[PDB]
Write an enzyme that holds these catalytic residues in place. Structure first.
Site, mmCIF file in Angstrom:
data_model
loop_
_atom_site.group_PDB
_atom_site.id
_atom_site.type_symbol
_atom_site.label_atom_id
_atom_site.label_comp_id
_atom_site.label_asym_id
_atom_site.label_seq_id
_atom_site.Cartn_x
_atom_site.Cartn_y
_atom_site.Cartn_z
ATOM 1 N N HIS A 188 -0.157 -15.780 -10.819
ATOM 2 C CA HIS A 188 -1.255 -15.040 -11.402
ATOM 3 C C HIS A 188 -2.374 -16.010 -11.814
ATOM 4 O O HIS A 188 -2.257 -17.239 -11.685
ATOM 5 C CB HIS A 188 -0.698 -14.217 -12.555
ATOM 6 C CG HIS A 188 0.207 -13.149 -12.087
ATOM 7 N ND1 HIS A 188 -0.290 -12.017 -11.500
ATOM 8 C CD2 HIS A 188 1.537 -13.061 -12.003
ATOM 9 C CE1 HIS A 188 0.733 -11.241 -11.132
ATOM 10 N NE2 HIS A 188 1.846 -11.862 -11.429
ATOM 11 N N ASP A 248 -8.981 -14.538 -11.342
ATOM 12 C CA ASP A 248 -8.985 -13.261 -10.660
ATOM 13 C C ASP A 248 -10.408 -12.825 -10.321
ATOM 14 O O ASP A 248 -10.653 -12.310 -9.237
ATOM 15 C CB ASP A 248 -8.316 -12.169 -11.471
ATOM 16 C CG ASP A 248 -6.796 -12.118 -11.383
ATOM 17 O OD1 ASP A 248 -6.242 -13.042 -10.769
ATOM 18 O OD2 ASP A 248 -6.168 -11.161 -11.950
HETATM 19 C C1 LIG Z 1 2.593 -5.267 -12.176
HETATM 20 O O1 LIG Z 1 1.410 -4.593 -12.635
HETATM 21 C C2 LIG Z 1 0.219 -5.278 -12.646
HETATM 22 C C3 LIG Z 1 -0.969 -4.505 -12.560
HETATM 23 C C4 LIG Z 1 -2.187 -5.125 -12.592
HETATM 24 C C5 LIG Z 1 -2.293 -6.543 -12.672
HETATM 25 C C6 LIG Z 1 -3.526 -7.234 -12.668
HETATM 26 C C7 LIG Z 1 -3.572 -8.601 -12.730
HETATM 27 C C8 LIG Z 1 -2.410 -9.366 -12.805
HETATM 28 C C9 LIG Z 1 -2.472 -10.879 -12.806
HETATM 29 C C10 LIG Z 1 -3.365 -11.662 -13.796
HETATM 30 C C11 LIG Z 1 -3.026 -11.314 -11.531
HETATM 31 O O2 LIG Z 1 -3.329 -12.509 -11.522
HETATM 32 S S1 LIG Z 1 -3.443 -10.320 -10.120
HETATM 33 C C12 LIG Z 1 -3.426 -11.672 -8.895
HETATM 34 C C13 LIG Z 1 -1.983 -11.907 -8.344
HETATM 35 N N1 LIG Z 1 -1.957 -12.873 -7.270
HETATM 36 C C14 LIG Z 1 -2.436 -12.551 -6.064
HETATM 37 O O3 LIG Z 1 -2.891 -11.429 -5.848
HETATM 38 C C15 LIG Z 1 -2.497 -13.646 -5.021
HETATM 39 C C16 LIG Z 1 -2.136 -13.221 -3.616
HETATM 40 N N2 LIG Z 1 -1.042 -12.264 -3.644
HETATM 41 C C17 LIG Z 1 0.181 -12.591 -4.024
HETATM 42 O O4 LIG Z 1 0.598 -13.764 -4.122
HETATM 43 C C18 LIG Z 1 0.912 -11.351 -4.453
HETATM 44 O O5 LIG Z 1 1.099 -10.578 -3.288
HETATM 45 C C19 LIG Z 1 2.184 -11.487 -5.316
HETATM 46 C C20 LIG Z 1 2.238 -12.804 -6.081
HETATM 47 C C21 LIG Z 1 1.977 -10.407 -6.367
HETATM 48 C C22 LIG Z 1 3.398 -11.399 -4.381
HETATM 49 O O6 LIG Z 1 4.154 -10.253 -4.674
HETATM 50 P P1 LIG Z 1 4.996 -9.474 -3.555
HETATM 51 O O7 LIG Z 1 5.180 -8.245 -4.348
HETATM 52 O O8 LIG Z 1 6.094 -10.278 -2.995
HETATM 53 O O9 LIG Z 1 4.006 -8.959 -2.429
HETATM 54 P P2 LIG Z 1 3.542 -9.718 -1.121
HETATM 55 O O10 LIG Z 1 2.076 -9.903 -1.056
HETATM 56 O O11 LIG Z 1 4.343 -10.922 -0.854
HETATM 57 O O12 LIG Z 1 3.987 -8.641 -0.013
HETATM 58 C C23 LIG Z 1 3.791 -7.211 -0.294
HETATM 59 C C24 LIG Z 1 4.695 -6.375 0.586
HETATM 60 O O13 LIG Z 1 4.247 -5.005 0.484
HETATM 61 C C25 LIG Z 1 4.194 -4.453 1.794
HETATM 62 N N3 LIG Z 1 3.176 -3.406 1.855
HETATM 63 C C26 LIG Z 1 1.860 -3.453 1.463
HETATM 64 N N4 LIG Z 1 1.218 -2.326 1.638
HETATM 65 C C27 LIG Z 1 2.168 -1.490 2.193
HETATM 66 C C28 LIG Z 1 2.105 -0.154 2.619
HETATM 67 N N5 LIG Z 1 1.001 0.582 2.551
HETATM 68 N N6 LIG Z 1 3.240 0.397 3.121
HETATM 69 C C29 LIG Z 1 4.344 -0.356 3.198
HETATM 70 N N7 LIG Z 1 4.519 -1.621 2.830
HETATM 71 C C30 LIG Z 1 3.381 -2.138 2.331
HETATM 72 C C31 LIG Z 1 3.861 -5.610 2.717
HETATM 73 O O14 LIG Z 1 4.188 -5.210 4.034
HETATM 74 C C32 LIG Z 1 4.718 -6.710 2.090
HETATM 75 O O15 LIG Z 1 6.031 -6.600 2.637
HETATM 76 P P3 LIG Z 1 7.068 -7.824 2.899
HETATM 77 O O16 LIG Z 1 7.943 -7.711 1.644
HETATM 78 O O17 LIG Z 1 7.690 -7.557 4.235
HETATM 79 O O18 LIG Z 1 6.405 -9.144 3.214
HETATM 80 C C33 LIG Z 1 -1.204 -8.724 -12.843
HETATM 81 C C34 LIG Z 1 -1.105 -7.315 -12.764
HETATM 82 C C35 LIG Z 1 0.151 -6.649 -12.758
#
Ligand code: A1I1O
Ligand code: A1I1O
EC number: 5.1.99.4
Lengths: 359, 359
Positions: B126, B156
């Site tokens: 995050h 962010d």
């Molecule tokens: C919990 O509640 C809240 C709500 C709000 C929030 C707001 C803010 C924050 C904090 C401060 C943040 O800083 S926000 C920035 C986070 N970092 C990134 O955004 C940086 C880049 N992405 C990542 O690194 C993130 O994706 C991750 C760290 C959050 C990783 O988490 P994962 O949950 O493992 O997700 P992945 O990105 O790896 O993969 C997602 C999977 O979902 C599948 N699929 C997406 N859309 C789909 C759809 N329509 N249908 C079916 N599947 C869908 C993808 O296919 C993918 O699947 P797979 O598992 O196969 O790879 C916090 C907050 C917290």
């Protein structure tokens, strides 16, 4: 000139803070940026790296000749940036209306804190002032202490320069249909409010209080905060999602069964005490190794001076070297029309030479 | 749809934090924004005001039909936003190459914290983690205490979403003369580094130290900090320029001859104690009155719940009422093609409907 804004012509009326930061980024991405400063400044090559990717020119805008050269540049340019108080450019004869007469394609970009009108529109101010009025500053810092400024990151840059850039580029897109420029009114008090839109969203649904240091993302949550380590250095924990938190706990050597629940806010004191003692038992670099390649969302809190030694920073070329200091490379990055390394501040140039080069 | 981005079409793959915020601002300025979420996370109308100015559709992107429908949207769109870990869209069959087959004009916008490659590129994270690595977090907070997160404003949004936006819009400009889209790689660790370029500039010229709480803009300067008042509320002081500083001292009732020099840093503790006693002798509102219309750079530090009562806020319509409460109006502002008040979060509509509407 490298980058996606190759071709774009920019005239910057020399100011401080957001105006030059915006101009820098346009320069960074390939724009042709001409900065008009007053001669009573201009005095050798600048040591201010924010003034990279620029041609600097001199011009007393209060004189008739100054004004007319300025208007010759603006005539031939796509964008004007000014960040003086409202009324200043009018009284120089460089107001929007005067510019619209020599070039109705101009994007007229106005960078202020308070806006163009209203009771505070003539008050001097800086970042800390603009974020004080819209609730932001009050939310930053520990609960047992007075608010602390987040440098000048939120008002000047995130909520300032960056909104100016979006307005400029949004206006340029508009000008593709209409064939006309327009005025962009970027106020830090407004930009910074849209910057913190998440908190306003959370506040509306009961998920953010006005109490400083008692929310999920302000340091109140034991799983989103910094911790002091054995060596007096710090790590950051950002383990919001339960699976990342579980990964953090396991790396820390704490069994979940001995701890209060992650989101039982009433027991956050105990939880913080447990996490605090655990992180304090080894040094920062220990934790950084334990958790590298992990989803535990634990990272070392590096000082500026150590950043150049971090592998992920080095490898992506986030920084470059220039005159006894690292500086950030352009962001964001583009697959086909990559930006190039920034050109340093150059010695001044004649405003005629520029008009020649621009036809 | 009102605003400079009327007729921009944007497909958003639903994530958290920066991607949604960038989508929001595009919407805000009049873009047509379609957000694909997964069926399992969607019941009623979403109560997250960040999802304003959108049409929501569901689709299992893992099904064959979900993918097909998605590629049909993207074929008709100008911009795609994704904020997943690198490799995620690729595996879905929605990577840049798959998209470039159905639409070589698409701006493919990738929002990550760590970037597309490099050793940290698969680590969960995050805001607090991204700003820990590049020197930013270390610089924020009081000197005698651990660093404090500036909410999630700097990674962010300021160094995140806003850099994605500058990239989307700059690439649209490049496209007008090249006929082609491209990939925008916006990493929070890069954007936030450019966001804080002023500190890197100052550090190169010996004007910033890595010591927390010891700088012009981090709260170490007595004339750039908050002060507690008689009622336990706060003012911010931002009186950098000597003339504004002088004005502040006069209004405090303080004789400049009795005080150490404004910028004698070795005596800042002493200066601070004198200013602390002065500000503590009256309540916040008293100071707000005293310094209205002043260049003293003293403003009341308002909490979120008080912002709706501030004349300068009310009269510029920085906010509008919605939903549970107040929300920031679009920023920045445009003279000719003005944004309209945001449309609240939609009911989820069917993806064919949209395709009809888009041909
Ligand atoms: C919990 O509640 C809240 C709500 C709000 C929030 C707001 C803010 C924050 C904090 C401060 C943040 O800083 S926000 C920035 C986070 N970092 C990134 O955004 C940086 C880049 N992405 C990542 O690194 C993130 O994706 C991750 C760290 C959050 C990783 O988490 P994962 O949950 O493992 O997700 P992945 O990105 O790896 O993969 C997602 C999977 O979902 C599948 N699929 C997406 N859309 C789909 C759809 N329509 N249908 C079916 N599947 C869908 C993808 O296919 C993918 O699947 P797979 O598992 O196969 O790879 C916090 C907050 C917290
Ligand atoms: C001291 O060193 C540094 C260096 C760097 C610094 C970086 C950052 C910061 C901090 C965090 C800041 O917060 S940056 C944000 C400041 N606020 C705004 O930018 C918001 C909007 N503008 C303003 O309010 C500011 O202009 C002001 C508060 C800084 C007020 O300054 P004034 O000095 O009153 O300037 P005005 O803008 O009102 O008037 C400018 C005058 O200059 C004249 N003329 C400009 N160019 C000219 C030219 N080439 N030739 C001749 N004259 C020129 C104008 O005509 C005008 O003159 P007048 O009004 O007298 O007719 C701090 C930093 C500090």
């Amino acid at each position: 000139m490298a980058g996606p804004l190759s071709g774009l012509r920019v005239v910057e009326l020399a100011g401080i803070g957001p105006g030059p930061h915006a101009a820098m980024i346009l320069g960074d991405l390939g724009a042709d940026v001409v900065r008009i400063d007053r001669p009573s400044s201009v005095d050798g090559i600048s040591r201010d790296a924010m003034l990279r990717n620029r041609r600097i020119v001199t011009a007393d805008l209060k004189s008739d000749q100054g004004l007319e050269l300025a208007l010759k540049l603006i005539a031939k340019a796509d964008v004007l940036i000014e960040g003086y108080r409202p009324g200043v450019t009018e009284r120089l004869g460089l107001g929007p209306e005067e510019c619209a007469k020599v070039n109705d394609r101009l994007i007229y970009a106005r960078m202020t804190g308070w806006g163009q009108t209203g009771p505070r529109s003539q008050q001097a101010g800086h970042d800390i002032n603009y974020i004080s009025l819209n609730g932001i500053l009050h939310a930053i810092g520990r609960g047992d202490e007075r608010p602390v400024p987040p440098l000048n990151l939120v008002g000047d840059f995130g909520g300032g320069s960056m909104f100016l850039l979006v307005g400029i580029l949004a206006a340029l897109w508009e000008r593709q249909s209409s064939g006309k420029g327009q005025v962009v009114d970027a106020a830090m008090v407004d930009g910074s409010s849209v910057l913190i839109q998440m908190m306003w969203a959370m506040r509306a649904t009961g998920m953010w209080t006005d109490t400083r240091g008692a929310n999920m993302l302000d340091g109140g949550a034991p799983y989103y905060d910094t911790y002091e380590c054995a060596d007096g250095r710090y790590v950051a924990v950002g383990a919001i999602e339960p699976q990342f938190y579980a990964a953090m706990l396991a790396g820390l050597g704490l069994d979940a069964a001995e701890l209060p629940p992650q989101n039982d806010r009433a027991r956050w004191p105990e939880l913080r005490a447990l996490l605090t003692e655990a992180f304090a038992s080894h040094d920062r670099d220990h934790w950084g190794a334990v958790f590298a390649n992990s989803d535990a969302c634990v990272t070392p809190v590096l000082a500026f001076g150590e950043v150049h030694n971090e592998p992920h920073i080095i490898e992506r070329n986030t920084f470059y070297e220039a005159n006894g200091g690292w500086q950030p490379m352009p962001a964001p990055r583009f697959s086909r029309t990559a930006s190039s390394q920034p050109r340093p501040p150059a010695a001044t140039i004649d405003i005629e030479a520029v008009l020649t080069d621009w036809d």
